[PDB]
Symmetry: none
Subunit: 126 residues, 13 copies
């Protein structure tokens, strides 16, 4: 039962990223969140100011997201970690169907009864 | 004060890998430890069976840049850092490699252990 | 006779994929269908949600001709069978320029309640 | 229980391939075994003559470790089954330099006269 | 004298392909005709169903270089030649392509028909 | 029964090429034989003088040859044609197992009760 | 080089390298030869070679296969210890038509005999398990012989250390799962998980989640579920509690386990009722672990 | 004491670049300023004459990572940092570019001026 | 006049690098010296622990082109130059590499020292 | 003196090619003229049916470099030269291409004609 | 400077090239001038018709901004009537799209004074 | 009449190249012979001075395909053919190379001499 | 006559380079000589120490045969004490293996007579 909550908040996070809802994204992220991601060019970026740019500019083409083989590590009643494979089927400029893989790690911390990302790590193609 | 504990067990970890000490490495890792790394080719590997191949089969200087630590209680932490590696190829020339590393530590029975780790870059 | 029966349901499968008819494609596939295909990027995909993106977008339509080469059928009892063949597709890209593509396909059929359904399939080089 | 039985004969298969024991590999394979693999260059290979070249030459031997990821088993009656999984091989090339390779494998097992035999198998990216 | 018959039916064949006339092409080919060609991607295609896609879906000047003819009786022949093709791409520039072609003709009921053909090079 | 003879002489030809037996090769070839082959660089070469070079210099490493999907066209009692796919498993300079595909056409003509190649056409990798 | 001339080779025994029966030509006698291909793992392997070969040169017990020589050839290495054809023990036992507390005490006794010897020799086996337990011959009264491998080690006197993480998840002591220094004791804990299977024919700990199996093994969570344990002498259950002790310093030594005879004296005093059900479960477990392991 | 004082004129420099104000950039740079940059193609270019072309011919987001300030007395400073720029390419696709920047500041008549500039290795 | 002193300590620096003399290099560098260089892979490395590895590891020729010196007071300077290096690659073919180097000198305790240096190219 | 006649018929040839005048080109070529050129893909093409296609298909500039003329009697000659061509590619960027051309002239019926020509490059 | 004279006529040459002024460029060049440049594909072109193509088509059309920088000029004086300048030419320009690009070209100009006026008898360019 | 007469001196040329006999090659070539060839890198090289380097520093098999001879009176001829060379590379692997060759022969004092040579495009 | 003089000293220069004779090359070169060549990586090197590396290491070791060809020399005379030659330099050599290779380099040599002797004040090379 305890892992289903992490599944819920994680799916809500991916839904916020897919729909480009940056406000819901900011609610589910700690203000001092750190991130390793291919868009950071091997650098560690802190805060949400770096992801806002992708929410505004990049995000009505049909896109489908698939979550493969999630693994959840529970570390108490206030901290959890989830790692999963993310597949994205989309359309390019030519309208051709395409697919992209991405390995993702999310570090959740329960603050004021609300889970928030303190750090995340994405790899593979962006 | 607690951050230096995570840093301490992390340095002990990196040295346990550099010397090829699979015993101390096994003690510092959870049996259900999960891993993302270029050696896994985009897959998620579980346990320490995947990492044994390297201690058994495999002049190096390691450098850690900008370590960040997230404490999540008194039994859970997460450290992220840049890992530069200066080594020599069989050609003899000094080469340098970068890898971004994320370690997730959990205190169990009064001892920190890795439950999951995520590395990117240098294979 | 049974071999020919497998050929029948297989031809109906190829025609359903070509017409972009996801309705008929759903009936011939098990709800928990297993899949290996290049669109999954080396991952194992379960269900029909993954192929729905290709039924909705791409296949809903320029002239395309399919050709099946060297089909082999293994009968494994009354309720199980497996067919392997080479699929060659002739099509047109943008302003054709006629193109051709090869793939090696394996289908694993299983009769459930008097109806052949795909339980798993494997595709290469597409 | 039956799923585990398939796992047993499959592990014995992988061990037989790793040890270069073509004798045991022959028993677990049907004489008319069908095969799709990158060593066949998109062609369908029948029999065990084709893999004999790899049993005789290459596998007859540096340290090699295999790892099976995400195995799925479809049971299709008492006498038929199919398993699909991801094989990851850690090895050494020339003067290692440790290397790793991924392949996606499908085995189609069929019990003939009280013994599981491979009737067809499919491999990708190796 | 007989070689010019094979050359004649061959030129009629190439013109039947250039004009997109699948009817005359079908008359000049055996129903069990086999084919090797780059469009088949290393496979051997049987019948004329594979070639219909081109007559239906698909400024060209064709040139034949060094035709060799092998007569094997009064009902079997085999011609091999180089086929140069001068055409225009959508970019408008004149392009040239080479393809080595082998045709196997068989007289059936007093009419030569292709039983098998093998092309290499230009796809 | 008539096609089995062509299979016999063809397998004898491939055996002569594999064993580097140039004299048996000359017996099964017409003196005025023509050939299209990748080693001829798109040119048509006549006679056996061009293949002798490959018999002498290139040809004790283990090599296995596989003949896939032969098709035979009988054109009387003195002329026949066979087309097939040829797979070659070999070892390179590094000892690594390798495989090569080649599409081949052989035009046989019975002279003095003995089949001989009047023309052949090979494509794919040499 | 030298094994080429003196010895003749015959059928395979097992595989992993390959075991094969041979016979010395010069003084005619059979042995069993480990053929360790020159491809092992570079160093980590070669280290375990000389360790295994050294340990076995040192271990000469009537209940343990003794080595003879270790010969190095060009593309191979050979290790010739003592030969056997006995089948496995957990395999022979099921074939028995009378299995009792008194046959099980006859086993754990010989076992503890091989163990004690080496514990006196400053060496710990660390991998103790049914697989590693074999029968000299199928001939009557054949002896149980400990199989020396290979996650093995040489301790100093009684000094406890961290020798690294090795052995089989079910056969692992808690001191090793806790990542604490260990020693000879980690061998006694195995016997205890072994005896328990040597009675009821199922293991004391197990879970499919191996994280959980380990928790049990760290928590000492085992119990004697009725009815099957009801017919078991309380002495049996006593030893089992002495070996299965979580604290290694409190754990019964091997020397102590021989003197307390729920084995030697219950051989004299214990329950012989042939337990057919236990034997059956046992056989089943065996097949499973062979396929699952 | 003056680290914030350096950050002030650095921020004013960034604002002068962002607004395309070449006059303010001229006020903050020494007349004989030298610059290494990828646009210089490995050459040492002197003066503001080279940067002029960019102030007269030019949606992005800039991030400064790991700033280090070296105070060299009461009239010299040197700041080094990593600059990550997120932008939209001609394809309208999000792209990101990394640069490593070093600014050398000199105090003359109570004002900080750039006496040398060094960037690598993205334009 | 005070330009050939920057040139002097710079020549002692380059010569200390070519001779593999870590002992002198440490004296010429501040303990908290920062560096940008290709060997750092875009990261900023502080101290000399990173540069130590490149002293443990035949004829080469170095040519310095267009040296420009900026004097900032009487206790700080900065020299930028192009460094060309001719060498031989295992097979022995002559090769040449270009680098763009910037050294930042500061006089503390009566001695010029590198506080930060920036390199581009090889 | 008789070199500028080879140059004259060569200039009328090149000008006939640039104007797309197949009519004059046919007059300047023997009916059985052989040709090696990149457009022939390594094959030897005989006649003018192959060159016709390249007459059906904006400002270009041609420069002839290092013309060498071999005179062989009074009814046969051979001129070899390098032909540089500046043009524009769809996007309009100026481009330049190099060619190595060899023309073989022969006087039959009182008229110089190409019997065979060989081209390398573009 | 005489050095200043050669730099003056050199900057007038580059100014005539940047503006596509073929008249001034013709006046500053000897009729028998030879040239090595990447546009010649490793050949030695002689005259001015080869550069006329670029003056007419490429450089006459330029309405976009172009800024030229002459880095590290070196002058060799060889008597009263001859000089030779070598420099690195860096061109900042706008490409087909509105993206600023930079090009480097090593340039050698050989000046000879005839009729009281300096003229190029030969130049040599490298890089693109 | 003279086509065989041209083939004779052509064969003698091939023999002079095969034997490495530079003197016989000198006798068969005009002192002012010009040559286009891939080894000339697109340049027109005159004389035998360029080919000398190959006669003083050099298992193969040569094949001549599609020879065409142009007789231009009683003192001029021109032969063109395709030359296919089979050889063994440094790897000991069979390799093949195609060239297109044009020889221009002139008769002076009753002997044929090469006045121009043109090869493309393999060395 | 003067054209022949410049070709003579040019062929003596190339002869000194082919033999690795740094003494003769030094005598034929001005101390303040500048250079553009691919070995300088787009930079203008001055002096002779940059070429000394190639004389000592590369060209001194050569025992293999090397043949140099000077194609299409053009000479510009600029008074009694100055000249400029441009030519295509084609080098036939043997590589690491025994395979003949050819290299092309466009060369400009600027000659100035001082102390009654011609010397290079500047040269410019292209291609490799």
């Amino acid at each position: 039962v305890r892992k289903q909550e992490i599944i819920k908040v994680t799916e809500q996070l991916i839904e916020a990223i897919s729909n480009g809802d940056f406000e819901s994204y900011t609610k589910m992220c700690d203000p001092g969140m750190t991130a390793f991601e291919p868009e950071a060019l091997g650098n560690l970026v802190e805060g949400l100011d770096f992801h806002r740019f992708y929410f505004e500019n990049l995000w009505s083409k049909p896109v489908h997201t698939t979550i493969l083989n999630p693994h959840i590590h529970l570390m108490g009643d206030e901290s959890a970690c989830i790692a999963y494979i993310r597949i994205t089927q989309y359309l390019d400029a030519g309208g051709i169907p395409r697919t992209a893989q991405s390995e993702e790690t999310r570090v959740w911390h329960r603050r004021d009864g609300k889970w928030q990302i303190v750090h995340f790590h994405r790899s593979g193609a962006p």
